[PDB]
Amino acid sequence: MVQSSVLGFPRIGGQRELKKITEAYWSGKATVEELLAKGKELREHNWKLQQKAGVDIIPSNDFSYYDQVLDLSLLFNAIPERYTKFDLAPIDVLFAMGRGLQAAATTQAAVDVTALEMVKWFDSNYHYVRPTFSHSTEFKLNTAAGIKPVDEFNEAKALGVQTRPVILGPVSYLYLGKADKDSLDLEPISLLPKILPVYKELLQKLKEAGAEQVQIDEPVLVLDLPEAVQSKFKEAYDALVGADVPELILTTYFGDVRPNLKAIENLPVAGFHFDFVRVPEQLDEVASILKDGQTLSAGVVDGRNIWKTDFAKASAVVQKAIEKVGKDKVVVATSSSLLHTPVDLESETKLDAVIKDWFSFATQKLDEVVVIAKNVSGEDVSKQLEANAASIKARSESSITNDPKVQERLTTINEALATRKAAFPERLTEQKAKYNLPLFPTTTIGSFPQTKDIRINRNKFAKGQITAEEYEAFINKEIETVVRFQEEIGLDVLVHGEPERNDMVQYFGEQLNGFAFTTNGWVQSYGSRYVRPPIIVGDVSRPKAMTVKESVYAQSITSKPMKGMLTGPVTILRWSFPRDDVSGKIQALQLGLALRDEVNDLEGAGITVIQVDEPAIREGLPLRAGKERSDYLNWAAQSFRVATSGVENSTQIHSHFCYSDLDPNHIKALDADVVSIEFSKKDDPNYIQEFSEYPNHIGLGLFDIHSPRIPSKQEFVSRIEEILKVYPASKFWVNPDCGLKTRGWPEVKESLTNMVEAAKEFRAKY
Ligand SMILES: Nc1nc2c(c(=O)[nH]1)N[C@@H](CNc1ccc(C(=O)N[C@@H](CCC(=O)N[C@@H](CCC(=O)N[C@@H](CCC(=O)O)C(=O)O)C(=O)O)C(=O)O)cc1)CN2
Ligand SMILES: N[C@@H](CCS)C(=O)O
Ligand SMILES: [Zn+2]
């Protein structure tokens, strides 16, 4: 009777309960008791949900108030000193690392401190708070905050639910972290010896509590790892394994671990886990490594995409496994945590029933693994296979999916379609001459605060409580407000705030043929911010203009130059749920050609300064050097270039990138005139050097837009002075790290006023 396993479940709630309480707590409208109360409530719900679904192995510690990595950075006490000298409570220290904190002296005692870096969790649009280590860091097992994975195991057990804690392992933990600036000579992985005795302690604490088996994520194995890292796995797991700890199920996902087999082919663990959705072909080789005892969790229900599973194909993999290692040592599992999927599809009432029948969100995926497991167990689930098999046939055969007019148009793509009419140095002279822009020119990145008044009115529109005529009126008020202000403040190149845009990708899925999109289809991106990425189901085209009506009005009320704003083709792909049938290369290209038509429409409609965001360009990079990556590099830029290479030289193409380990050389391939690079929040020591040679114009981001912190005019100056030491002023632009949707108005005002005030000084010194 083959068992089922889930690697992690989405904590946000079916009604984003979690967001709502977290944001309340942050704004002083809910007590700390009330936040923790609701945490419990959700934890309880989701465990019970899975229990009822029939899942055998059920995760614990997958819950988090912000990020499960940081959660460990807390537990193990990797807490930069600067966060400690304010008598904050564990929970608030946690949040402060997250989003900084700043309150003047109230009883309440005065704090001001930044936030730690945030980066892509592998090739996903989930972002973790990056561990930050230092020579001073004393790894102890913190008990002040409680001990989370213990306490949550116990909770579950007190509802009769036996769970499998999930912990990021020492090697991944370190390798993914970073040295703090007070300690540049520090490889994070060198602390392995200091940290194990902590992981060890935790583990015994868990064993005593009742923990049979523990999932311990070591996903770094899907990456290119130098030889000196690979040898540290044995050291690590040799240390931890024992009679006083639970059995450990070394867990990998998102890619291929074969290059690292030597690393792990003689470890003491109780079993492994692998992603046979992304890399089914690795099964024979990895299964080879299993010395008796050990179990193989067979990751076969996609924790990263929402296409309904093919029960035939999936069960065939699990049986290939069963052939190699015995039915009794095999487990049907999600390929990854379902963190990256929405909660429940049944919450969606406005999708074509045909299309809906093609999908499965988290709740459904629980049934999925339950059924496949049952299948291979010899049990009758005939009725579910056929229905499932129907769902597949249908998908397979659809008039929706294909659009010949597109497929042809693809063969119009060549070098010329993706080269501008002249080189940057020649376009600058034309642009300088049109725009008359001043030295140290100031601008922002697009979005301005997404005020509940905007959210409520988009919604009243969606739901017919107001006419289109009324919505246009409302949007214009708000673009007017957003301009009038930008003018007030002194900004040079303007934007329009994106008031009319739910999300920089969803606004587009709602407008392009080939898509679907959700109402309650939300996934966490970081902290309390979530998105409901759209879904690509067919061949992509743009039948109308998407953003002209708005930007033309925008341009019409200001003499100032104004940006249009799209989302480049790679980002639309990467932050959508991609197609099952086809490659992403084919999808980007379609998007490129499709986005051209908007870009062109803009130029034609008067909007001669245009920004096309491409922030996922690094995210979307394949997890391993070789054929697939070097292809990615080439088509990924090409598609971008496709949507931008028809413009006149007098037109100013802008881009933007953020919250990623950016590769300048690839960014450069886009030959954009001007870009915005997230720099402040990420405290990257090298970004300055590594972008020493960037040939086109550039604005490294001057303040962290994900903290309510207002930076001094002084903190702007410092950063600038710092950059100017490696870069000439005739290139440098001044802007924030990213957009301002999440920000409130008070701090928007004051922080830009400072930014600009500061730019204005360097203006006059030169
Ligand atoms: N997709 C994406 N990825 C990205 C970024 C980005 O902007 N987008 N930037 C970086 C960071 N990621 C981010 C992710 C989300 C948000 C964000 O601001 N999300 C908002 C809302 C976004 C949205 O979809 N807004 C809708 C939702 C409105 C709403 O909630 N309405 C209510 C009903 C009306 C009401 O009561 O308010 C409801 O549905 O229940 C809208 O404006 O229309 C949030 O969940 O806090 C920001 C950055 C990197 N990756
Ligand atoms: N233009 C987007 C960029 C987010 S990465 C915004 O300003 O919200
Ligand atoms: Zn950004």
Determine which residue's CA is closest to atom 6 belonging to ligand 2: 739
Our answer on whether the CB atom of 125 is closer than 6 Å to any ligand 1 atom is yes
Determine which residue's CA is closest to atom 7 belonging to ligand 2: 739
Ligand in closest contact with the CA of 446: 2
Listed residue (162, 166, 146) closest to 154, CA to CA? 162
Pocket test for ligand 2, best of 738, 742, 743 (most atoms within 8 A of CB): 738
CA atoms of 132 and 116, how far apart (whole Å) = 8
Our answer on whether the CB atom of 445 is closer than 6 Å to any ligand 2 atom is yes
CB atoms within 10 A of CB 765: 8
The DSSP result for 353-413, as a single string, is HHHHTTB--HHHHHHHHHHHHHHHTT---HHHHHHHHHHHHHHHS-TTT--HHHHHHGGG-
CA atoms of 60 and 249, how far apart (whole Å) = 14
CA atoms of 204 and 147, how far apart (whole Å) = 12
CA atoms of 550 and 712, how far apart (whole Å) = 34
CA atoms of 53 and 75, how far apart (whole Å) = 31
**Residue 439: DSSP 8-state:** S
- How many angstroms separate the Cα of 196 from the Cα of each of 32, 63, 202, 310, 430? 32, 23, 10, 41, 60
- Sign of the Cα torsion 431, 437, 440, 445 reads negative
Tokens matching residue 131:
């561990």
Structural domains present in the chain: 1-397+519-533 (3.20.20.210), 398-518+534-766 (3.20.20.210)
Contact 4, 115 (CB under 8 A): no
CA atoms of 117 and 127, how far apart (whole Å) = 10
Q: Which residues are annotated as a binding site for 5-methyltetrahydropteroyltri-L-glutamate?
A: 19, 125, 503, 526, 529-530, 575
CA atoms of 591 and 221, how far apart (whole Å) = 32
CA 671: distance to chain centroid? Answer: 25
Tokens matching residue 507:
């606004």
The Cβ-side half-sphere exposure at 430, using a 13 Å CA radius, reads 17
Tokens matching residue 163:
């769970």
CA atoms of 137 and 572, how far apart (whole Å) = 40
CA atoms of 115 and 95, how far apart (whole Å) = 9
Q: Kindly report the length of the chain.
A: 766
Q: What phi and psi values does residue 220 have, to the nearest 5 degrees? A: -60, -20
CA atoms of 539 and 708, how far apart (whole Å) = 41
- DSSP count for the chain of H helices, then E strands: 28, 23
Active site residues: 706
CB atoms within 10 A of CB 585: 17
Q: What phi and psi values does residue 271 have, to the nearest 5 degrees? A: 180, 175
DSSP SS3 for 327? helix
Contact 545, 601 (CB under 8 A): yes
Q: What residues pair up with 674 in beta bridges, in sequence order?
A: 654
Listed residue (252, 336, 283, 290) closest to 5, CA to CA? 336
d(CA 501, ligand 3 centre) in Å: 15
Q: Which residues are annotated as a binding site for Zn(2+)?
A: 656, 658, 678, 738
CA atoms of 467 and 462, how far apart (whole Å) = 10
Q: What phi and psi values does residue 619 have, to the nearest 5 degrees? A: -45, -55
- Sign of the Cα torsion 169, 170, 175, 181 reads positive
Our answer on whether the CB atom of 450 is closer than 6 Å to any ligand 1 atom is yes
Q: What residues pair up with 103 in beta bridges, in sequence order?
A: 111
Pocket test for ligand 2, best of 450, 562, 613 (most atoms within 8 A of CB): 613
CA atoms of 272 and 290, how far apart (whole Å) = 9
Determine which residue's CA is closest to atom 1 belonging to ligand 2: 446
> What stretches of 305-361 show up as alpha helix (H) in DSSP?
311-325, 353-356
The vertex-6 CA angle with 128 and 286, nearest 5°, equals 85
Atom of ligand 1 nearest to the CA of 15: 40
Determine which residue's CA is closest to atom 26 belonging to ligand 1: 502
* Amino acid residing at 206: L
CA atoms of 263 and 234, how far apart (whole Å) = 7
3-state DSSP: the chain helix, strand, coil percent, rounded to 5? 45, 15, 40
Ligand in closest contact with the CA of 524: 1
* Amino acid residing at 414: N
CA atoms of 407 and 540, how far apart (whole Å) = 9
Q: Which residues are annotated as a binding site?
A: 19, 125, 445-447, 498, 503, 526, 529-530, 575, 613, 656, 658, 678, 738
Looking only at the bridges linking them, the beta strands covering 523-526 and 247-251 are: unpaired
Contact 7, 215 (CB under 8 A): yes
Q: What residues pair up with 251 in beta bridges, in sequence order?
A: 217, 273
d(CA 501, ligand 1 centre) in Å: 9
285-289 long-range Cβ contacts below 8 angstroms, 24+ apart = 285/258, 285/261, 286/257, 286/258, 286/261, 287/321, 287/324, 287/325, 289/261, 289/264, 289/265
Contact 676, 701 (CB under 8 A): yes
Q: Which residues sit directly before a break in the chain (C to N > 2.5 Å)? A: 106
Contact 492, 560 (CB under 8 A): yes
CA atoms of 560 and 554, how far apart (whole Å) = 10
Cα Rg of the chain, angstroms: 26
Residues 6+ apart with CB under 8 A from 499: 448, 450, 454, 475, 478, 479, 482
Contact 729, 764 (CB under 8 A): no
d(CA 524, ligand 1 centre) in Å: 10
d(CA 140, ligand 2 centre) in Å: 39
SS (H, E, C) 57-73: EEEECCCCCCCHHHHHH
CA atoms of 617 and 595, how far apart (whole Å) = 16
Listed residue (585, 586, 546, 565) closest to 495, CA to CA? 565
CA atoms of 703 and 765, how far apart (whole Å) = 22
Burial letters for 663-675: b for 16+ Cβ neighbours within 10 Å, e otherwise?
ebebbbbbbbbbb
CA atoms of 308 and 390, how far apart (whole Å) = 11
Our answer on whether the CB atom of 571 is closer than 6 Å to any ligand 1 atom is no
Give the chain's largest Cα–Cα span. 80
- Burial class for 28, CB neighbours closer than 10 Å (0-12, 13-18, 19+): exposed
